[PDB]
Design an enzyme around this catalytic site. Structure first.
Site, PDB file in Angstrom:
ATOM      1  N   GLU A 483      50.295  41.882  47.452  1.00 25.79           N
ATOM      2  CA  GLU A 483      49.332  41.537  48.432  1.00 25.79           C
ATOM      3  C   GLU A 483      49.293  40.161  48.710  1.00 25.79           C
ATOM      4  OE1 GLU A 483      47.771  44.771  47.075  1.00 25.79           O
ATOM      5  OE2 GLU A 483      46.221  45.258  48.064  1.00 25.79           O
ATOM      6  N   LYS A 596      51.589  38.610  43.159  1.00 26.04           N
ATOM      7  CA  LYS A 596      50.451  38.945  42.567  1.00 26.04           C
ATOM      8  C   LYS A 596      50.483  39.839  41.423  1.00 26.04           C
ATOM      9  CE  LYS A 596      45.791  40.888  44.056  1.00 26.04           C
ATOM     10  NZ  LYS A 596      45.346  41.534  45.331  1.00 26.04           N
TER      11      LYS A 596
HETATM   12  O1  LIG Z   1      42.889  48.588  42.404  1.00 25.48           O
HETATM   13  C1  LIG Z   1      42.711  48.473  43.744  1.00 25.48           C
HETATM   14  C2  LIG Z   1      43.668  47.452  44.506  1.00 25.48           C
HETATM   15  O2  LIG Z   1      43.135  46.093  44.005  1.00 25.48           O
HETATM   16  C3  LIG Z   1      44.056  45.085  44.586  1.00 25.48           C
HETATM   17  O3  LIG Z   1      44.203  44.787  46.058  1.00 25.48           O
HETATM   18  C4  LIG Z   1      42.975  44.852  46.674  1.00 25.48           C
HETATM   19  C5  LIG Z   1      43.389  45.522  48.068  1.00 25.48           C
HETATM   20  O4  LIG Z   1      43.870  46.796  47.934  1.00 25.48           O
HETATM   21  C6  LIG Z   1      42.119  45.805  48.887  1.00 25.48           C
HETATM   22  O5  LIG Z   1      42.369  46.162  50.294  1.00 25.48           O
HETATM   23  C7  LIG Z   1      41.210  44.452  49.035  1.00 25.48           C
HETATM   24  C8  LIG Z   1      40.043  44.473  49.543  1.00 25.48           C
HETATM   25  O6  LIG Z   1      39.210  45.888  49.200  1.00 25.48           O
HETATM   26  O7  LIG Z   1      41.223  43.839  47.645  1.00 25.48           O
HETATM   27  C9  LIG Z   1      42.326  43.450  47.118  1.00 25.48           C
HETATM   28  O8  LIG Z   1      42.164  42.732  46.180  1.00 25.48           O
HETATM   29  C10 LIG Z   1      45.597  45.188  43.986  1.00 25.48           C
HETATM   30  O9  LIG Z   1      46.289  44.131  44.576  1.00 25.48           O
HETATM   31  C11 LIG Z   1      45.971  46.420  44.740  1.00 25.48           C
HETATM   32  O10 LIG Z   1      47.429  46.648  44.678  1.00 25.48           O
HETATM   33  C12 LIG Z   1      45.199  47.593  44.054  1.00 25.48           C
HETATM   34  O11 LIG Z   1      45.386  48.904  44.457  1.00 25.48           O
END
Ligand SMILES: OC[C@H]1O[C@H](O[C@@H]2[C@@H](O)[C@H](O)[C@@H](CO)O[C@H]2O)[C@H](O)[C@@H](O)[C@@H]1O
Ligand SMILES: OC[C@H]1O[C@H](O[C@@H]2[C@@H](O)[C@H](O)[C@@H](CO)O[C@H]2O)[C@H](O)[C@@H](O)[C@@H]1O
Lengths: 751, 751
Positions: A483, A596
């Site tokens: 991300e 990340k």
């Molecule tokens: O476990 C959930 C998710 O966490 C992290 O990423 C999040 C992202 O998927 C989300 O859209 C935003 C807003 O809700 O927050 C982010 O931190 C992680 O990086 C991701 O891979 C994981 O599925």
């Protein structure tokens, strides 16, 4: 009730409100979840009362799993003064989650300012066998005094979501009814969007040598709280038994017309049984689950205990009778990510269920199947084809990702994951293949599975864009597993996964055309499938831009990544977690090569069969150097690929990271809920990493362990094509015992 | 705003929830009362929000003044985390009630766990000039940081009555409406009995150098709480001004059809003024009141300060525009005795108002006048005649005394005060005489006063029973001022007071027949008064059994009292308050000669003109020996009669008891509300005891001081037949200055 043995206990030291233990001590049965608060509900605790699938938006930014009224409250009064454990001298304190029996236990010996001494001892649980039921039982002794005690059960309907954040507080329900029905008290609500109704009935009583001994029972309706009260003439040194059952019922259950009558009836039934009887039934269910999911590690106590913790929560939170819900990023244990379902579930959590209790995994895939219409609709509205599953998913299956939030510096930032983190659709396809291959659940494959893989393939076909210059299909303007980097081209993980999904789908059409022609036609009428299509997916798959490069051997995470400023981890915090290199600005992560979580390495794990031992090791080394582990998803993937490239130190370090995610609060935010992917990562690392399980091309199960030095042994069980297999792994060899048979199955040992 | 000087300040030392300071720091304006909680409303505080006259019974044992939603809450958030003063390092704390300006002030300098330092400084008050208004103003500085602050105003409708007692909690209102009207937020309610509606509107805003500086205002309806929120981009070291006005309106006020429109309108007006302007108007009112009610003592600092405290609350709590309410035993400061009105008001409190601000006293007597019908009805239902006023009185004027409660050992006990503590009817009569004689408010006497004295006389006539044996009327089966002894015969206080009331009434008929014949006939048509009646009252009065005995000189408190087991005080607690003699069983007080408070001595004070210096001293000595001071009513009467029999030590001891009643929490239960009689006792002791004021038969004011050695001087003012008189009393002589004239008035000095 006797507490289990200790290897089985997780213990809180100090009596206090604790965000972390609210999470770690959360109890759930897959339908109901209850945050681990103390019974008295102290000012500062954050209660959580959830029911799988009940979501609400109202004035909030996106829909959210609803924090319901809190029903478990119980307080004691001595001559009408509340015995407040926080205002006493604590002479004895014990509080443990017992993982084997699935209960939360507390013993207290208190001395109040008037010098009176009282012990309060017992436990609660959320019935594994009876899904609407929660059970509490506490024993009170007045040690050195006599008095009138009031025992106060209560249901508190002042709860809201996002309690501690003034901008985001919303109350997601309204009260419909409150009632003293003599046998208990009732409170029922309706969600603000008006989609779900929940009812809560609850009955307390108080015994002394098994006979009802309260001289008075009264009730109070204080608006947003209703109470049931039991007055006792308590004699010094006598043992008063308090037993409180409570029932939740929601409109999500079947032939539930009147939640009020359904609750009362239900409670009437459960009340024909004692708390012991109900506990016993509870425990049989936990036995049955642990008998397969338990994992003994000999010679590392902190790891054995830790893993038990991870596994406990995994077995607690899935409910295979429910085909219309799945597991949110934080279980039913908190409001982090608001109960939304991510790829976490399909890729990290699901393997545990596939091999452990495959019915569960089937239900979770039903969740996605049942939302195919919403995934089609989602693709249409972006200009695509097929099923494009949303990045965050709730009840309706529409996209639920926030448009913005707060970055690491606490400032507003746009969130594009919901727009361009497309890989979710492949991951689901993948998980369907993955369930089926372990289970040989061909029926599932034919009626449901293949529709999913095909409809996602149709989507990948739609978004792949042809490039004449390099003569290859690309997928541009994307977010991959990492991300940190946004709007990139040809994220490696994304392209292989797309390729994979296009191929499986054409291959599935062939299988079905040849070997299952009635099913292929059932399906073809249904989703307008023509046997010209698969050629299209093959054409595309064979040209999708994979980057190598033939020698050098190193997979660029995405086009241009290597031109980015480079940094060197160095320095770890007290939980052995990376610290930000100096000079890194936390809102400019796009510019640097720090990642990340597993991304290219993620690719190596899921598509193992496409990379050789050397490419794996080269890329593992390059990227681990550079992974900040700023998701709880990360360590486990690096533990598992560690072992597989033969770096067993990196591996054990990283394993202890995923296993301790919530128990040591690695990531700083356990208080928001259990890190559920991390639980499944932990399991995956054990079984598919250290335990050396893997799958050879023609679906032969291989074993090929690699204990860390330090661990004398490792037993786990798993289900493989219908066969329940116990492996015990020693440093030397491997034992194997088929506890359940279904055909002969090929296994392939060390060595 | 500059704080007053210090002699004028009452200070709390530690920052904490405090039942005592909730009481001592209660602010009121005679219509609204607000308990002295901190702005943030900590878990453990007990808020109090009252409006004079709004009572409710609902499921409770007897009717009660209603604790309304709490409107004053204000909390700060830094980047969405609540700045909790209890979870910080307190670098500076100041909290004082300023008695001269009538405000509550708090300055805080805090350091939170993230090392940020914030100061919060300001005050609140309940407008003396504008009866619906409450004003708050606080200044925030971020000392060493920048952030987003959220300033959260809120109205909390989860309040209940009897918060800490599970058996007695009741919520006495339901919410009717909640509303963000852009300019503020509104919440309105209706009582459960459906007799009163209250509306609360409130508007906050945030300034920086007088200009609005919040970038965002949002609102939240969380069911039983509504909030108004102001987001600021706060710069280090800048001074943010928070100003919150709030308006309460009830159905008790006139031409208030729609409380919602009346509140909003009202608030719109008050918002055209700043908090300073409103404070200034507030203070002018306090000036005007103190200019007459202040009392300087030179040479005893702890007494001067203390007395100021007592007087402050007295001037704060009466509202002469309201003829349909009076002062409950605990002001508008708590729920002790639930806002009910006792003889406390007529006998202890009223003198302060008669001499200090006689309009107030007139309104309080109107309260009783307006409930004459209910007093008639009360007599009829017991088999009596005339007006029998209830022992506890609320809005309707029916008897509101509990049938039972808990004795000193925490056990259930029958309460008979509401059945047989009859003297209340005389005390009211008495207070009508007493108001009139000081004021010469003849009009009042003619239109209202005399009806009251006559109708109570008709009642005493009805209950006096003739005895042929001793040839005297008796009043049997009674409770006198000393609640310790129940079902007695010929309580001395009761009989003299009855005699007195029968006589005044016959004398009043004569005055009116001769000197005011139109008024006597207006009245005679109204209450069927025949000029044969008065002869009956005279006949009775002249035979009412008074006990002497001619020599020995000692007035038996009631027939048989002297045959009771006798005990000797000895031993005082840390507040210099009697401790129970050994061998006294606290639920057998009927058997002993210990008394709860002034009873025979009470008689000596109110009917001074009937006992000579020797009988006074003999009875004072006998009964003081034996008074436990288990009501806050007691010390003052013993201070005042002390001086008058010339025992000036006993006097100063007892004075320091009444003056410190709440500030030192003498009686152990200040947390339930201000001890309002005790405030007026304190004043009475000063003026009519130490100041040596008294009334000679033909209504000549005499002065005849007797400073305790220790006090260089004593000035107080009072109103006497329309003349405002300043006395300064030194050890030597007495100065006198008529600041306002109305005829020549007779005064009679030392000596
Ligand atoms: O476990 C959930 C998710 O966490 C992290 O990423 C999040 C992202 O998927 C989300 O859209 C935003 C807003 O809700 O927050 C982010 O931190 C992680 O990086 C991701 O891979 C994981 O599925
Ligand atoms: O100031 C009120 C009242 O307090 C004391 O007596 C109380 C009595 O009047 C009342 O009926 C019962 C129940 O409410 O409580 C008693 O303690 C005091 O003795 C009395 O004279 C005074 O007016």
């Amino acid at each position: 009730m006797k507490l289990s043995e200790r290897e089985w206990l997780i213990e809180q030291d100090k009596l206090e409100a604790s965000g972390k233990f609210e999470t770690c001590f959360a109890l759930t049965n897959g339908y109901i979840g209850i945050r681990g608060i103390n019974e008295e509900v102290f000012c500062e605790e954050t209660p959580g009362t959830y029911i799988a699938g009940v979501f609400d938006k109202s004035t909030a930014q996106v829909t959210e799993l609803v924090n319901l009224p809190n029903p478990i409250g119980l307080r004691i009064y001595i001559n009408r003064e509340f015995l407040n454990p926080l205002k006493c001298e604590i002479l004895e304190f014990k509080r443990v989650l017992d993982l084997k029996q699935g209960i939360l236990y507390r013993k207290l010996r208190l001395k109040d300012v008037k010098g009176r001494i009282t012990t309060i001892e017992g436990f609660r649980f959320v019935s594994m066998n009876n899904k609407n039921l929660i059970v509490q039982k506490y024993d009170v002794v007045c040690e050195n005094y006599s008095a009138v005690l009031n025992v106060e059960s209560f249901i508190d309907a002042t709860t809201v979501n996002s309690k501690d954040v003034p901008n985001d507080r919303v109350k997601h329900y309204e009260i419909d009814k409150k009632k003293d029905f003599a046998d208990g008290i009732y409170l029922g609500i309706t969600t603000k969007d008006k989609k779900y109704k929940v009812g809560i009935a609850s009955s307390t009583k108080v015994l002394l040598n098994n006979q009802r001994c309260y001289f008075n029972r009264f009730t109070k309706d204080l608006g947003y709280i209703i109470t049931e009260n039991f007055e006792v003439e308590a004699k010094q040194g006598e043992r008063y038994e308090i037993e409180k059952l409570t029932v939740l019922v929601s409109s999500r259950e079947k032939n539930v017309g009147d939640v009020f009558e359904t609750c009362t009836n239900k409670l009437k039934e459960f009340e024909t049984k004692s708390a012991e009887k109900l506990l016993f039934e509870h425990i049989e269910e936990y036995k049955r689950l642990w008998d397969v999911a338990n994992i003994d590690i000999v010679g590392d106590e902190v790891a054995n205990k830790s893993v038990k913790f991870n596994i406990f929560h995994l077995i607690s939170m899935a409910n295979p009778e429910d085909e219309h819900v799945s597991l949110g990023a934080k279980g039913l244990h908190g409001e982090g990510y608001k109960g939304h379902v991510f790829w976490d579930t399909e890729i990290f959590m699901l393997p545990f269920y596939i091999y452990t209790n495959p019915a569960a995994a089937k239900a979770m895939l039903m969740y996605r199947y049942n939302l195919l219409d919403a995934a089609r609709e989602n693709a249409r509205k972006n200009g695509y084809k097929g099923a494009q599953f949303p990045w965050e998913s709730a009840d309706t299956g529409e996209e639920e990702t926030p448009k913005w939030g707060y970055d690491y510096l606490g400032n507003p930032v746009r969130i594009w994951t919901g727009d361009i983190e497309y890989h979710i659709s492949a991951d689901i396809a993948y998980a369907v293949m993955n369930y089926v291959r372990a289970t040989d659940d061909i029926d599932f494959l034919l009626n449901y599975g293949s529709e999913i893989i095909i409809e996602t393939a149709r989507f990948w076909a739609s978004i792949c864009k042809y490039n004449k210059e390099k003569g290859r299909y690309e997928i541009n303007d994307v977010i991959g597993p990492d991300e940190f980097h946004e709007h990139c081209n040809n994220n490696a993980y994304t392209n292989y996964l797309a390729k994979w999904n296009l191929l499986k789908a054409s291959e599935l059409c062939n299988l079905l055309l040849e070997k299952y022609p009635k099913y292929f036609e059932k399906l073809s009428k249904k989703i307008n499938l023509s046997d010209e299509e698969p050629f299209v997916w093959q054409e595309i798959a064979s040209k999708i831009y994979i980057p190598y490069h033939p020698d050098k051997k190193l997979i660029e995470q995405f086009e241009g990544y290597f031109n980015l400023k480079d940094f060197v981890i160095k320095e770890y915090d007290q939980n052995n977690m990376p610290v930000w290199p100096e000079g890194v600005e936390l809102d400019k992560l796009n510019n640097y090569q720090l990642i990340k979580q597993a991304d290219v390495v993620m690719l190596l794990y899921l598509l193992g069969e496409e990379f050789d031992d050397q490419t794996k090791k080269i890329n593992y080394d390059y990227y681990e150097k550079r992974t900040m582990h700023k998701s709880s998803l990360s360590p486990s993937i690096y533990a598992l690929m560690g072992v597989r490239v033969g770096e067993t130190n990196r591996a054990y370090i990283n394993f202890m990271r995923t296993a301790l995610t919530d128990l040591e609060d690695n990531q700083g935010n356990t208080h928001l809920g259990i890190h559920a992917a991390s639980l499944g990562g932990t399991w995956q690392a054990l079984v598919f990493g250290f335990g050396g399980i893997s799958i050879e091309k023609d679906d032969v199960l291989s074993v090929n362990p690699w204990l860390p030095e330090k661990w004398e042994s490792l037993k786990f069980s798993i289900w493989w094509k219908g066969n329940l297999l116990d492996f015990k792994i020693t440093k030397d060899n491997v034992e194997v015992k088929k506890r359940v048979e279904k055909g002969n199955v090929k296994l392939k040992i060390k060595g």
